[PDB]
Design a protein around this ligand. Structure first.
Ligand SMILES: C[S@@+](CC[C@H](N)C(=O)[O-])C[C@H]1O[C@@H](n2cnc3c(N)ncnc32)[C@H](O)[C@@H]1O
Ligand SMILES: [Zn+2]
Ligand SMILES: [Zn+2]
Ligand SMILES: [Zn+2]
Length: 214
């Protein structure tokens, strides 16, 4: 292979965008216990999980047995870039992934709406057909094109195996990819994109494919 990009670990703010960090006092504390099985885990009633808030290890009553630290720990299932025939480069998981498990964080440059329009405009002028913009809110957009991680390679599907979720982590809203089903080793990882009047024909191959991305 793909053209170059900078492989980065965390989002990078651009221009007027600033990252909002919580004071420790502002991070919510859940009611989970060190003596629960799988504290703050997928099965649990964790109040932080419910609201898509990541626990902070200095706040959580389960301390370091807390299973709600996925963004901060940066443990992603090992993945691999693949070449497809009609959807460019994509991404496959090397190993099996369980339903609801954290797959990756969608990282990139954090830009505002005006910057995003400017990049889309420049891209169209240079006949670029690959876009990597994901809306966090109307005026906060992650562009994983110049800089990102492997999540930038996940193609669109009309019947995806992953979905995006917006999580609050230490006071900042971040975007994670999570498995919608049990995914076997070797499967291409996809999500349903959301995303001007530009449409790209879809080659996802799903039975419910609309024909366009998204
Ligand atoms: C975020 S990138 C995904 C990785 C990209 N395939 C690459 O080669 O770098 C998004 C671009 O991939 C293409 N793409 C992704 N899913 C597709 C699909 N299902 N059908 C056709 N093109 C797709 C479109 O060009 C889209 O703008
Ligand atoms: Zn908890
Ligand atoms: Zn916790
Ligand atoms: Zn499709």
């Amino acid at each position: 292979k793909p053209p170059p990009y900078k492989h980065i670990k965390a989002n990078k703010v651009i221009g007027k965008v600033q990252i909002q960090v919580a004071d420790l006092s502002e991070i919510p504390r859940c009611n989970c216990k060190p003596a629960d099985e799988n504290p703050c885990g997928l099965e649990s009633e964790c109040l932080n999980r419910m609201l898509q808030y990541e626990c902070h290890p200095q706040v959580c009553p389960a301390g370091d047995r807390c299973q709600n630290q996925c963004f901060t720990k940066r443990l992603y299932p090992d993945a691999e870039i693949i070449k497809t025939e009609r959807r460019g480069w994509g991404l496959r998981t090397k190993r099996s992934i369980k339903k609801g498990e954290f797959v990756n964080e969608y990282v990139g440059e954090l830009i505002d709406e005006e910057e995003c329009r400017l990049r889309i405009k420049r891209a169209h002028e240079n006949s670029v057909t690959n876009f990597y913009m994901l809306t966090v809110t109307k005026d906060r957009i992650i562009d994983a094109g110049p800089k990102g991680n492997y999540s930038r390679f996940m193609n669109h599907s009309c019947n995806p195996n992953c979905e995006t979720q917006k999580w609050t982590v230490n006071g900042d809203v971040r975007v994670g990819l999570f498995a919608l089903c049990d995914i076997p080793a070797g499967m291409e990882l996809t999500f349903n994109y959301n995303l001007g009047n530009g449409r790209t024909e879809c080659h996802c191959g799903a039975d419910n494919c609309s024909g366009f991305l998204g």
